[PDB]
Design an enzyme around this catalytic site. Sequence first.
Site, mmCIF file in Angstrom:
data_model
loop_
_atom_site.group_PDB
_atom_site.id
_atom_site.type_symbol
_atom_site.label_atom_id
_atom_site.label_comp_id
_atom_site.label_asym_id
_atom_site.label_seq_id
_atom_site.Cartn_x
_atom_site.Cartn_y
_atom_site.Cartn_z
ATOM 1 C CB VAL A 87 -0.742 0.108 1.339
ATOM 2 C CG1 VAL A 87 -0.462 -0.103 2.412
ATOM 3 C CG2 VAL A 87 -1.794 1.244 1.385
ATOM 4 C CB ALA A 88 4.205 2.028 1.552
ATOM 5 C CG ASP B 226 -6.415 12.078 -46.374
ATOM 6 O OD1 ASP B 226 -5.597 12.699 -48.441
ATOM 7 O OD2 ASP B 226 -7.157 12.369 -46.852
ATOM 8 C CG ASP C 94 -8.000 9.136 -45.696
ATOM 9 O OD1 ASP C 94 -8.888 8.899 -45.081
ATOM 10 O OD2 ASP C 94 -8.495 10.279 -45.727
ATOM 11 C CD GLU D 164 -0.774 6.664 3.260
ATOM 12 O OE1 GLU D 164 -1.486 5.289 2.930
ATOM 13 O OE2 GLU D 164 -0.497 7.646 2.393
ATOM 14 C CB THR E 293 -9.272 15.122 -51.057
ATOM 15 O OG1 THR E 293 -8.445 15.827 -51.757
ATOM 16 C CG2 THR E 293 -10.822 15.725 -50.696
ATOM 17 C CD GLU F 178 -5.107 4.306 0.914
ATOM 18 O OE1 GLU F 178 -3.717 4.369 0.478
ATOM 19 O OE2 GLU F 178 -5.631 3.453 1.748
ATOM 20 C CB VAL G 10 1.020 -0.022 -5.716
ATOM 21 C CG1 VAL G 10 1.720 -0.934 -6.104
ATOM 22 C CG2 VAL G 10 0.515 0.461 -4.019
#
Lengths: 971, 175
Positions: A276-277, A323, A668, A733, A325, A758, A279
């Site tokens: 948890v720290a 392209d 195209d 944390e 057109t 969080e 990530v």
Amino acid sequence: MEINDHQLSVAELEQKYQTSATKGLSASLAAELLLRDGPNALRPPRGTPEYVKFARQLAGGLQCLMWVAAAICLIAFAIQASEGDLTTDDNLYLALALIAVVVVTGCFGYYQEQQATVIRDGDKFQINADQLVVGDLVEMKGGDRVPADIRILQAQGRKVDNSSLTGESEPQTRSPECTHESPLETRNIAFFSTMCLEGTAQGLVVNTGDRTIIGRIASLASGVENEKTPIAIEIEHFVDIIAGLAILFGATFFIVAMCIGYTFLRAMVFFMAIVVAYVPEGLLATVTVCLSLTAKRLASKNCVVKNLEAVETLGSTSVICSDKTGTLTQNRMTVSHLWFDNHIHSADTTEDQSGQTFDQSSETWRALCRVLTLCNRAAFKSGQDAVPVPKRIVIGDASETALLKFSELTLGNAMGYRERFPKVCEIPFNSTNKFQLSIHTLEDPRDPRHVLVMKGAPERVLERCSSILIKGQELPLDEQWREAFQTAYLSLGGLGERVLGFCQLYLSEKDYPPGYAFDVEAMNFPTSGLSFAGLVSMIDPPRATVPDAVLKCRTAGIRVIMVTGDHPITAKAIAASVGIISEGSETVEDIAARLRVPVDQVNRKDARACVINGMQLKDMDPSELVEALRTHPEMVFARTSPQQKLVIVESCQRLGAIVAVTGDGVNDSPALKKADIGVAMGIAGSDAAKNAADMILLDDNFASIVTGVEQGRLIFDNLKKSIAYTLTKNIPELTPYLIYITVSVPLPLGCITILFIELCTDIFPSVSLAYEKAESDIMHLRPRNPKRDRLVNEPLAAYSYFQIGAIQSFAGFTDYFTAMAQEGWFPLLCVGLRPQWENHHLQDLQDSYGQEWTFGQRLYQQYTCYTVFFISIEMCQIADVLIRKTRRLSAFQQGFFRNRILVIAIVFQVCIGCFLCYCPGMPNIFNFMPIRFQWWLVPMPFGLLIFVYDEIRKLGVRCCPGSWWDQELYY
Amino acid sequence: RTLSRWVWISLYYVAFYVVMSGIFALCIYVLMRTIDPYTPDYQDQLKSPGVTLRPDVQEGSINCTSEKYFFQESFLAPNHTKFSCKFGKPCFIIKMNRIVKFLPGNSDGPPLYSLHYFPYYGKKAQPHYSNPKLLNVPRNRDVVIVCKILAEHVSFDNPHDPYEGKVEFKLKIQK
């Protein structure tokens, strides 16, 4: 590339086909051939199931990584539940949130994200188009769509629109004779997914269904690795750095724990504990809301984005192969220039008619205007008045419509003229005559005598004239003028414009009575010795925003490359017009022309600009293409086939650039499908281009492309700030648990407490960062190198973890010591206590003072600590919020103040914390205890130091841009 | 990852983390200043006393008798250490968790403190201070017994600290 039969004789073709040229196949034979080959239909991919659509997202990068965490967190629960049963939700629930974050996170995306005319047995009949088979005789006329790939056996005045292949709309002739070795180029083949503009033609069906050139483009262009988004590639670099540290420390805390005297049971639990720290659980959601929020603004902009990732794709590209057109242009054209009064004039070609007025004054002009309106058959479709003239549909050939639109615009109602001078008789433009004339009663009431007006091939009109209306008066057609005309004719012709000659004659009344009959059949009246009025040419204009849009991209440091099916004279002209080719730039041919030297003589390096014909491109090796790409700053590939457009893109990608293809047509498709990002035009765009593209410009507003690129810039930066902000809190944390193990002190912060930070407190602040502005002129900088500059880099981790988060931890630890110390537990005494403290049996625990505390009593104190620690982070998070607001700039300069959303974040965040502390029921439900007013202050010095420390650091970065602080610390 | 510049990093943190430990300590030491040596700033956590027991789940001094509270004076250093009063079928001993200046107030299930001690002055003030049987018929079974104390000052937290002013233990003398 394809290989074909255009070389074969018609007879040879039938022989191969077992078909009759005149009669066509027999009903029996057609059916037999059907069963053998199969239907004239494309074989689909299957539709794509709904279940799979959701499931693919579930991997989503971080999503998989989160699974590893949840599963690993289960590694903890499994070992724990087995050997040392710790009845707690901690690891189980911890593991759960991580996975669910994907299911809930994944929602963000789900919540926001015919007939043909054939000839058989000598009779023609209409049939279901699917019924068409190779071999049969098909007839197409103006207005129809070509039912299948065909070999033109016969045609009369037939023109076609091959924008689907080329992206160029101007009509192309179809004749039975093979024009060129390239099948896409030859006149004798008419392609499915194309429409016969005018004329009539008959051809033999060479290819059906999937077999047609376009009927395969989709499969070939569709089943092509449409690459990914520069943003997606970047949102993986940060996670790897994060994981890198999470694992380094997680394990390092295994070994350290081991030396200290923890078993395989304990050392292991910590490693997984250490997650948890590292990530950031919140990060995925933030990036998405950020992307989603930005997209919403663009929608307000009249710019719709189908994909979230699409918001950014506008910044990490070196060269853009566009392209023409429907991409660069809106798809249209018109007249252009007039020659009279021995002078060349230029009309306004634009839709908006943003240009200026060339000439009202001349007497000549009106005489010319008169012929343009009168000697003209075209009429506007009825019910048009609401729509603007250049927009409204006219019935008639293109050239005549052009004249009609010209006069109606500058002259007022054409009908008015047509009425005022009634048409008595006219000789419709003949193939032979190469001219069209009419005789009209003159409106002038004194006169109402007869006027003769005609138009046609400029050379032919000149053969026919004695005099020239210069200014109001006629004059002899001296050789001197014969040439001035000849010069004008040649020049305008050079412009790539179609030219028409105009002349009239005031008929001699004596010969022609008021009643006087005229003979269109046989020249009842004079065809020669007429007064030549003037010349009119053609021309086409592009959108309004496009030239500016091109300019903006170039400042952006983006290379713009035109890639068009159209002819080179036209392509180059627009290239200059839009700015793809800058003034003074030159191709080798232009140099040779000016120098009047041979091309072989010219040094290629001298020419910055290039224009390469598809026919030439065909011969070149890809290495040769690469060099052309390396060698020139302003490139125009003209008369390119769809495959060629693809090659250019691949060539561009080979260089390493991120390429955006912008296009409108079926031609195209392979390119759009190949580009890192394909952008298609909403209105004009063919369905194919639309399916092929990543983004659709609903508006056909090219300017949106600039906004799109910009969108990929501010947020990208602001996202880092939100990552930095979120990650920093990780440290305060983590450390409590570690110290808990190392120091043997009571646990300073709990699992529940973390979640409120969080899930609750950090959220509004983190999101609020999206509102941040540019610290500098973002447009001024080059696109980011997707490989080199990652969204999350090591300089972010060091700043979040090493420095800032560290200050935050102490602020938390301080409040911890204060609460316990106040309670009677001085810090010195705290070491080694946890076993007694945690020991449920001891009701007796003696504090520093000598008092004794029960299990619950001391626990309430600890929980209070958990609560104050939680609060300390919010107080420190306030500083982190203010500092995170800017990477370079001083809060003073940026004004931390302007961002209202951010400030909202501080107030609400604090309100939430106070709520968690104060509200009753919160002590049981979340184990949060009330805090004395004094407790609120503990982190304050820590919060202030953070603000000062960062502020001081950035002042340093600014002073010395080149060196160390920036190198290490600068995100 | 640099070279001949790491000295610009090491030296940096040396006297930056230096400056920060220096400030962190700076703020602990100010905080510490504003507390009594003799008495914590908040008694509230300890507010009701808990009851704890012995079973893991005097030279000088003064002679005393069961009587009322004895006031030593203020909680101050000007006087020397305040004087303290003297003091199968398992026996368990119970005591009342010491709390400074707290005066306790006082002036069938299955088969099975003197005021003169208070207030407690606290360790700094009173170092060797001394705070103040289940013969039961049954056996070979788990018996749940709750011993508790009463008083206006005493409160129990059934939902929480089961310890608060009471015990809960399950003796089993399997013979």
